[PDB]
Amino acid sequence: LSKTFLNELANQALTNPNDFTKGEKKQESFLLEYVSANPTGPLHIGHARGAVFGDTLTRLARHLGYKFNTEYYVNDAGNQIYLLGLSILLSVKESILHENVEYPEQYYKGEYIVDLAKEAFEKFGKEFFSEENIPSLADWAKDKMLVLIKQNLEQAKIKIDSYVSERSYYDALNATLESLKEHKGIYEQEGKIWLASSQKGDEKDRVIIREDGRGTYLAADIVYHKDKMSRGYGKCINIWGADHHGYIPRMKAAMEFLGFDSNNLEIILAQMVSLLKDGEPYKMAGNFILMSDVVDEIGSDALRYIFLSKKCDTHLEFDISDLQKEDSSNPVYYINYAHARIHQVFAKAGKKIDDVMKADLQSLNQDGVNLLFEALNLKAVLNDAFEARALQKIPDYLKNLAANFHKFYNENKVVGSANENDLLKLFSLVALSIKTAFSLMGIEAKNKM
């Protein structure tokens, strides 16, 4: 490899560190809709992989110069959020008002439900709490839960750019039906309006409008997707749970019956995650494991690492006891340790990264040149990771780069040596790749351990 050439690349990277590996403005634009959990509680742990994957995808797309929007769909219909209003009323009655109450077979319970009930009782007063005020309670509640969900996401360094309401699509149903008919996608049978999805590769035809006159969940989903796909984006991306694979053909069929090319709807499937502690499955104030509880225990960086660390449609198993170790087996520690080790050697040498810029890297041994190449190779990795949707290439890159750095620095004396500046400049570039790649994972690199 040409050290002269790589040194020039090193100089370009280090002169404008914030622009290192950033791509020029791209032509293809995207709309990602992800997470989209019901506003009826805090995020469960099963939402974490989709959330972590989507935010990393977003950060990566933006870094590479793609126009990339994010959106969350709020299932906030009165009929959807009624049970949440019901459940708060019931826990006001039993935990605050102390009466014996009838409980249905499906209801929301937990520490969050009793805290919100205490918030409800303080805001509305005792008088309010009757069956007629349930949807007034549910509206207030679902807004509080959406605030909760937003901060659940913020805890994991995730912000979504647009939250959209189901309720704002009640007027949009007719235009969907019409557009579907204009492509011969709908028909009446047995008092119901059906989508002819089996004419477009689905297993069987599907109900759009019930005999009741009401739209189905599928109808609502089609309406929303019609809006998303007619917004001018190059592609719409969804992240769905892997158990929703059978739902793909009916949605593609619907999009074809709306005049859209269904290849412009990309479905990414997020597979199940197994969390372990001490070899046993993770467990514990609720019947579900909360994303919040896991972030409380392991921290944000660990969540952002673990949930990105294996191919999205493959099963991920991780033991959280590994985060107690301070070696190769705790990759967040180990990668951060590489970055911190560089920061410390610069302090030991009494130098800033601008003092070593003038070095030309010509004295680097083969191990140093490999590490230099590896540092600069981030650009290739990031572009490849985006285009293949293989985000686990980012942790993989970082793992190997930290390993190789650590091994290099163990075997090479720096401060006081005749090529101190060459080695420091090398190190400054390794630190930059660690910091850059980590930031796209929503992790800030540590200067000190």
Side-chain angles (χ1 to χ4, degrees):
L1 292 174
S2 180
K3 277 130 107 195
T4 310
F5 182 74
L6 296 173
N7 185 55
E8 279 320 297
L9 291 189
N11 280 338
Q12 289 159 208
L14 298 164
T15 305
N16 316 276
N18 287 165
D19 298 346
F20 175 60
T21 68
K22 280 195 175 158
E24 302 163 53
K25 184 252 188 67
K26 301 271 181 288
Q27 292 290 148
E28 196 174 355
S29 60
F30 303 85
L31 177 62
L32 205 214
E33 178 232 326
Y34 74 120
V35 192
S36 298
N38 294 334
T40 59
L43 296 184
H44 297 155
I45 194 54
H47 289 114
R49 197 181 198 164
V52 166
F53 190 94
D55 186 59
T56 308
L57 225 217
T58 307
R59 287 172 184 268
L60 181 56
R62 255 108 92 152
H63 182 81
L64 300 173
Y66 295 92
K67 290 184 280 299
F68 201 99
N69 270 82
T70 50
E71 191 162 288
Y72 183 118
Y73 184 76
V74 193
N75 285 284
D76 69 343
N79 312 265
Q80 296 266 64
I81 67 170
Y82 187 81
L83 227 189
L84 180 74
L86 183 70
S87 303
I88 292 160
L89 172 82
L90 265 44
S91 78
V92 156
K93 282 184 174 174
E94 209 179 57
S95 79
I96 301 166
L97 254 45
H98 306 289
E99 61 248 36
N100 185 249
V101 277
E102 261 272 346
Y103 276 104
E105 301 309 306
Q106 298 288 331
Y107 66 105
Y108 305 133
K109 53 226 145 199
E111 196 183 339
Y112 85 100
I113 221 81
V114 306
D115 297 350
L116 194 54
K118 281 191 76 178
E119 259 184 300
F121 188 76
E122 205 66 51
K123 160 84 171 178
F124 293 107
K126 196 158 83 95
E127 327 155 55
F128 187 76
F129 295 95
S130 54
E131 274 200 40
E132 65 189 60
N133 286 306
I134 298 171
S136 292
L137 220 200
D139 288 345
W140 172 86
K142 72 98 167 77
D143 280 326
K144 290 268 103 164
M145 291 297 87
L146 212 57
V147 159
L148 184 57
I149 284 163
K150 281 176 192 192
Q151 57 202 207
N152 280 185
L153 288 171
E154 226 284 88
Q155 202 179 0
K157 313 288 172 291
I158 301 159
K159 290 179 182 290
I160 294 178
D161 288 0
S162 186
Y163 290 74
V164 292
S165 173
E166 176 174 25
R167 283 206 269 247
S168 78
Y169 290 99
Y170 280 155
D171 291 326
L173 175 60
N174 281 53
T176 299
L177 296 177
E178 281 294 275
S179 178
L180 253 16
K181 204 206 162 65
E182 285 162 27
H183 297 91
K184 300 169 175 183
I186 55 166
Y187 64 87
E188 186 277 333
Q189 188 186 285
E190 279 296 315
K192 296 165 194 173
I193 294 154
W194 296 75
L195 173 83
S197 46
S198 63
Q199 299 186 13
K200 244 87 185 161
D202 188 15
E203 167 194 15
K204 60 178 188 178
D205 288 347
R206 313 288 168 170
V207 178
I208 297 312
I209 309 299
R210 298 148 139 194
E211 73 294 316
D212 206 344
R214 263 104 89 88
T216 57
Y217 297 119
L218 183 66
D221 210 8
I222 296 177
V223 170
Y224 178 48
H225 276 83
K226 182 183 174 281
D227 175 22
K228 290 195 299 183
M229 298 264 270
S230 61
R231 280 189 218 168
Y233 295 96
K235 275 248 209 158
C236 293
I237 312 174
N238 294 348
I239 300 167
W240 292 351
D243 51 353
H244 295 141
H245 183 256
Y247 197 83
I248 302 176
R250 76 194 74 170
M251 198 57 37
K252 305 276 208 166
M255 298 305 100
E256 290 291 337
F257 276 137
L258 288 166
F260 302 122
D261 180 6
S262 59
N263 285 340
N264 291 339
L265 185 62
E266 174 185 334
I267 311 300
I268 292 170
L269 294 177
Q271 257 276 36
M272 211 84 174
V273 176
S274 293
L275 279 169
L276 300 172
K277 191 222 267 277
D278 299 316
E280 212 194 32
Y282 194 90
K283 53 159 186 58
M284 90 152 291
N287 216 58
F288 301 99
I289 302 154
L290 273 54
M291 183 177 139
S292 220
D293 287 345
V294 171
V295 185
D296 283 331
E297 194 159 344
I298 73 169
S300 183
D301 300 340
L303 191 99
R304 293 304 297 252
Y305 190 94
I306 291 161
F307 283 84
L308 205 74
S309 66
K310 197 70 266 307
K311 194 170 190 278
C312 207
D313 54 2
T314 74
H315 289 276
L316 191 262
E317 186 198 63
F318 202 88
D319 202 323
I320 68 162
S321 61
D322 299 7
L323 314 170
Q324 302 264 232
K325 288 288 180 73
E326 285 179 37
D327 54 73
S328 326
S329 61
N330 185 3
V332 197
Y333 168 86
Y334 198 57
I335 296 157
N336 265 327
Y337 191 41
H339 189 267
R341 215 127 86 87
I342 293 155
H343 186 82
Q344 261 53 257
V345 74
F346 266 92
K348 184 181 173 161
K351 281 172 178 166
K352 284 179 78 180
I353 58 179
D354 310 79
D355 306 341
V356 307
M357 190 78 82
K358 31 86 104 280
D360 55 32
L361 271 21
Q362 216 62 56
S363 74
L364 258 30
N365 64 18
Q366 189 60 66
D367 279 318
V369 182
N370 289 346
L371 190 61
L372 170 62
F373 178 81
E374 198 173 19
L376 295 166
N377 194 228
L378 180 58
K379 199 201 213 314
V381 175
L382 296 179
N383 283 284
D384 218 287
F386 179 71
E387 291 160 35
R389 315 292 188 257
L391 303 183
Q392 79 284 345
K393 299 265 188 65
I394 306 173
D396 289 352
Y397 167 83
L398 237 26
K399 255 197 300 182
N400 296 323
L401 179 63
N404 294 326
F405 166 75
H406 281 302
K407 196 208 187 308
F408 184 79
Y409 183 37
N410 288 355
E411 304 301 322
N412 290 266
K413 217 278 211 92
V414 176
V415 181
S417 82
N419 296 308
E420 183 182 297
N421 292 357
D422 268 2
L423 297 167
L424 289 176
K425 191 186 167 171
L426 174 60
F427 285 17
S428 75
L429 195 64
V430 179
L432 179 60
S433 296
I434 286 171
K435 178 151 103 87
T436 302
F438 252 174
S439 72
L440 302 180
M441 295 176 57
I443 298 173
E444 183 180 346
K446 291 176 191 149
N447 293 329
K448 271 268 198 182
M449 308 299 291

